[PDB]
Amino acid sequence: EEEKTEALTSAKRYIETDPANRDRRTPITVVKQGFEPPSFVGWFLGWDDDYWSV
Amino acid sequence: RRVVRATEVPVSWESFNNGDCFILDLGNNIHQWCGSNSNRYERLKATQVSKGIRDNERSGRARVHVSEEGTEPEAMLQVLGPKPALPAGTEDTAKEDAANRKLAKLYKVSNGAGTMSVSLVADENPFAQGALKSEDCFILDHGKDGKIFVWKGKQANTEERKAALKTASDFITKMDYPKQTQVSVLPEGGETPLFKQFFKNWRDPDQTDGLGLSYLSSHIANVERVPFDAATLHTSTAMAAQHGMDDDGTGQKQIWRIEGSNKVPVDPATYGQFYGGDSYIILYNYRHGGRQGQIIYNWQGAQSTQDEVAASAILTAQLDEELGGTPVQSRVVQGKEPAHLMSLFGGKPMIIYKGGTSREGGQTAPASTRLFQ
Amino acid sequence: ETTALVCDNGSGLVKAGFAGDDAPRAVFPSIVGRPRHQGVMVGMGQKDSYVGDEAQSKRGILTLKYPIEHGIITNWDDMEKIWHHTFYNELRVAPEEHPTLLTEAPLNPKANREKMTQIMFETFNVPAMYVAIQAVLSLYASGRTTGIVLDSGDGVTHNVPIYEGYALPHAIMRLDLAGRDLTDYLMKILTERGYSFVTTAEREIVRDIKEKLCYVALDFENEMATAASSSSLEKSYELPDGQVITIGNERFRCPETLFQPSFIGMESAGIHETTYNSIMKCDIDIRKDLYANNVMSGGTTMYPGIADRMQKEITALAPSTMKIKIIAPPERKYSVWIGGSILASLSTFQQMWITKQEYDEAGPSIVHRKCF
Amino acid sequence: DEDETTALVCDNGSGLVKAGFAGDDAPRAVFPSIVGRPRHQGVMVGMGQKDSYVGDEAQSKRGILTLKYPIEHGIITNWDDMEKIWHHTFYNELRVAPEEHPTLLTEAPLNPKANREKMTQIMFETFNVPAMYVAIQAVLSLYASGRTTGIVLDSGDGVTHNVPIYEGYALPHAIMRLDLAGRDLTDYLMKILTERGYSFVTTAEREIVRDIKEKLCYVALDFENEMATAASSSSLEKSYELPDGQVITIGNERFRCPETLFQPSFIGMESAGIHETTYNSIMKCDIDIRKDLYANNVMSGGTTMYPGIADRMQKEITALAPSTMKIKIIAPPERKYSVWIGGSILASLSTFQQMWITKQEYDEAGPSIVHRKCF
Amino acid sequence: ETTALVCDNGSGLVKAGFAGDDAPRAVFPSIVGRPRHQGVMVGMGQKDSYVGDEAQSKRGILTLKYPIEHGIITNWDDMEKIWHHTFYNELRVAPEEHPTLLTEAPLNPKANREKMTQIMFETFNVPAMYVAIQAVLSLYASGRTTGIVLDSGDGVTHNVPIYEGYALPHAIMRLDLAGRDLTDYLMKILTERGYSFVTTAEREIVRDIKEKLCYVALDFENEMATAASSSSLEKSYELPDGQVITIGNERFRCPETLFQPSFIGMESAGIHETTYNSIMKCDIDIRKDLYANNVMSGGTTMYPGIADRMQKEITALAPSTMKIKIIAPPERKYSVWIGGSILASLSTFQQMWITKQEYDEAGPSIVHRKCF
Ligand SMILES: Nc1ncnc2c1ncn2[C@@H]1O[C@H](COP(=O)(O)OP(=O)(O)OP(=O)(O)O)[C@@H](O)[C@H]1O
Ligand SMILES: Nc1ncnc2c1ncn2[C@@H]1O[C@H](COP(=O)(O)OP(=O)(O)O)[C@@H](O)[C@H]1O
Ligand SMILES: Nc1ncnc2c1ncn2[C@@H]1O[C@H](COP(=O)(O)OP(=O)(O)O)[C@@H](O)[C@H]1O
Ligand SMILES: [Ca+2]
Ligand SMILES: [Ca+2]
Ligand SMILES: [Ca+2]
Ligand SMILES: [Ca+2]
Ligand SMILES: [Ca+2]
Ligand SMILES: [Ca+2]
């Protein structure tokens, strides 16, 4: 969980420190394993739903 | 008994007794002989003086032997002769502790008062190591067996040193010492361990106090807890790219697929049409003028099993060695191809099918309805 | 048409089977057990020596001897008993019509190599044989050809860097510290809690305790402070006579001899310094992929947390621009056998076989020239 | 020289307690460490019938007592009886108050840790000593001989241990411990006396068999020739008188009993003998220091007091070692008390006063100070 | 009136003594040993750091470190321990009374020279000091003013051309293999006979084996053929614990790393053609006497047969219109000290000292303008 929280802070600091200025209120959305929205999934070439499930 | 001391005695069997301990020094070999009636403290002093003669006078270029009655080596019997009967030994009383207490006279030589001064520091040993001041020159006179030590300080003047040597030479003829008396000149940090025995608890500067600690010669990671800064991510985007793959990839290539335990060539109408559950080897020849050259790529599908990828690696190494070792290899998995490998087919896409060959099922039939991304 | 045999003879275990298969058929410990008590009941089934799992099942009344001590073979009659047991009793096959692939640790004395030939063509009369390096078989079993292999079993622990499918002989390093030494160290440090283990059967029990209840701490001093401050790390084990023992900090002190060899009194450095100096003795251009392909093999690399600790120690030693990937497959206990099984089953392999004819015209020196 | 001290040295071994003052040449109080309790019905009221007897007065009344050793193979098991023996040796033997004397204690290597914390706790809380220290017995045995380099085989009543020391530095990885000593030899002699028909079962009979072992047993130079000599003739038989006047005769049992030290398979132990234990202790030391460890074999403890054990020890190590090396074995006649003599040396050394575990260090650090200060 | 001191600081063997002597008074190895176990017998002379030949005596219970590696001082505090042991324990003199001559490696960095000057004048308080070069003192001890010097000790091998009594910096060439790497290669090639030498304590044993039993073969292939066929060159050595090892073809294979660096995986050139590469970098007119004066210096020139092999290898690839002669004095392991002892005792050297007051109003920078 400390990986999760300090990764949230690191993702925020990665947003403000980019050279091309972007929107400071760029939203951080937490995604769980096995429950992914299609917005996350659509960037992956060849998603398998039953990859992690044995 | 309490104040144990060493005294030089002439080298003969008649000088030996059974109630003391003896050290026979023969250069590179030192023999320690312990009497049967000798006690604990003079055995410990014999060990200490023998290790001092080894490690300080000879700098470790010696070997110390410890012996008792009946176990004398050939060296002691060769030097001293055949062994007579020993004339026993007196019990260790307190009068010879007082005799050992009166053996040395520590004198001072100093021009700190503006004039010549030879004065008595002490006549009662064990002396104090702190009494040896670093700005003066001291004299120890154990001249009964013929030893006079001139100890020089680091911050002593030259005329103090010459006066100390002159006074030590003057001690020869005044008190009527015998005509073999050695005047040993000793600087700070270079003291003879026959000089050291008259001092209460001599301390070398790099001694071990207590049990001590090991050095261990090897250490594990003890990195400090730094917070990580994320601005190094999008900045400093270093990249190496390719080193010799400058061609656009028309070339002349051969593609093999591994089935079971053997590779076969694929059909030449089907270059960029791979199976996801198979393993492939691609040999590629440079037509480019950069000294020609050959590339062997080892492509491994994601659905491919362990036997196929292991056989692909072994056949890749065998194909490298049977061409003389001139080509260089590049392991590649599905999804992680370089830009040069995608350019081998000449503007064609890489078609990846589903399924493949196996040792027990062979080639899988394709599905009726197929979807491609 | 004849199926070749693959027989990985380790210091602690023997993994034997047929080429082309995915798993070894016979896995059994390489011990020879002999009776030490007086037999009073006549007839029955008393034998002069017991080999393998039969010696494990009767180990209360047997003294147990390992033929292999720190990689080299000390007893050859017992090793012949091991080979006879794995041919005739385990695989139940006649070895005079099957070529046999054998494995060997690198920087071994040369006198073993012809001697392993000297039994195989004279007693069992194999048609062909081959000797392969264990590390290149482990690297082949991962599907890789360039990388560094840390092979750590029961006898030795060696780092081998391999480039283009050939090991570099000027950078192979050997460390005589493996699972038997960790077992002996765990026997030493279990006396602190009052448990005495001196018998070879008790050595087998402590080896089982080491397999079930040991792990590598990510940092040693903080874990020692945690074990001192509470009792959350304590675990219980049941001895076969029903006695229950409890171990605390000794769970993680026994793998730490891998990273700090001074616990058992060795001046030599740990496995991470051994990997770093093995990488540093290679050429400058090929150091990039040696750090990125760092596979692990053997049963001694099966502790929890060994890969994270190894990446932590290598990362502190390497330059920060380098990328470190410690590769720990779940099948790494049998990776030597899998690489040998795939390598023996190939159709292009049947000319590197050292057959009978060149052996008995060349003598016991053909193995030094055909097996590189 | 060395400065005067008022310390106490108490070698509390498995069989005997040897207590005395530091600086003396001999321990003042030597007595067996047993606690005796009566097992019969007391019908005569009066005359001070105690509930428990400790030390030499338990030996005088051993017929009507059951005797217990609190120390078994070096480990203290019954702490109440150990506290009783410590109270007896402080108050009834040395006749001193422990509040103004530092105490030096002895211990075998490779004991459990809890023995060391409980020794710390009963010395500091019950007796209120101002200082305390525990030391390894073989280090003291090498102190008594006057040497620095050597391997020490110390064999008492419960523990037989080999410790190698080069210069002042010990090698902990090469230390060997074997639970084969005078207890096991006494029990084996109790077993093999049944071959002649003499049955000894009780604890007082065990003390009688221990006296027989001390007064009659010896180590044969070679076993099989001595068996043939004992079988052929009757010159090796010797007699002993029991305290009720019965006379027994023993033959080969004189030398079969200490042979268990060289062949532990007589009592079912698969471990090797003391010669192989010494040889494998030398082999785990690295290659540069074997030559000095061969020539400085030091034997200490009461179990090393058989006649002929040094010659047999010489022959077996000479057989095991290569022929170019010279093997010398140091067996002083005072080796029964050499642990106490080395404790008397070490407590009086001027370097040692900065290593006492004081009272305030124990008060701030608990009983776990002993593993950071001692060894 | 006072006598100067000469101290040649080798990378593995330091030499010291008084000026005007035909031999160094003290030869002892430049090591610093530290204990690796705990000293439980207190009050019996345990030290935290054993320096020099004393550390060679009790080398089993110590870890050894070399303060000078590859001819250059790296660890400075240990070098102060070496110098303190040299002055106070070994030579038994006060440094305040005696001037001191030191020797340095060719192409020494300037900061090491300044730091040598600073610890020489501050810590020990010498009244005078001078720094010289290894190879020019070797050439002066040979009685020449022009020649090539092959100085090969324990750390590095230097080829230094000297013309008119001064070196040529553009042609001084450094080859980084010496007796340390020969010792390490001998530990490598004794493993096939079954002997293992891993720690720094028994590296000295392998160094003694290399010194007592090694030779340079005049031709390598026929020597290997006769070693393979017969057994007339196999000889035994007695390890100091009593075991006896035997060595065969490894007796001559271990000096051959100097002529073939590929035996240890080093891609550089052998010792014979790097002298050719140095002498081609010199001017065309001065090569006639430079070829004729082939001075060999250092301890690893003391193999038997190295001079004849060097004569053959230079004569093979130099042109046939000139004569090659190799000189090898019997005192060539002490020749730097002999040149320093001649240099310090001259009647023109008292003005070339760096006195204390010149360092006082000059700082640690006058060493460049005077030692030149
Ligand atoms: N007879 C010999 N045969 C072979 N090697 C020898 C012999 N005598 C000495 N050596 C080796 O020579 C080296 C020491 O030589 P030398 O004292 O000239 O070198 P150094 O001054 O310490 O080194 P460097 O000049 O590189 O700093 C050691 O490696 C030693 O093993
Ligand atoms: N789960 C485990 N955890 C820790 N160690 C293990 C585990 N399984 C096996 N080992 C160790 O691995 C060693 C054998 O490893 P392996 O290399 O497979 O056999 P060999 O060494 O005979 O080739 C044994 O000594 C055993 O102690
Ligand atoms: N003369 C002797 N011969 C053989 N054994 C002896 C002799 N004297 C004492 N012993 C044995 O020594 C053992 C105890 O010796 P010691 O080490 O002094 O006591 P502890 O073991 O209590 O320290 C006793 O068990 C006794 O059997
Ligand atoms: Ca006396
Ligand atoms: Ca003065
Ligand atoms: Ca497939
Ligand atoms: Ca290639
Ligand atoms: Ca293995
Ligand atoms: Ca004892």
Ligand SMILES: [Ca+2]
């Ligand atoms: Ca030199």
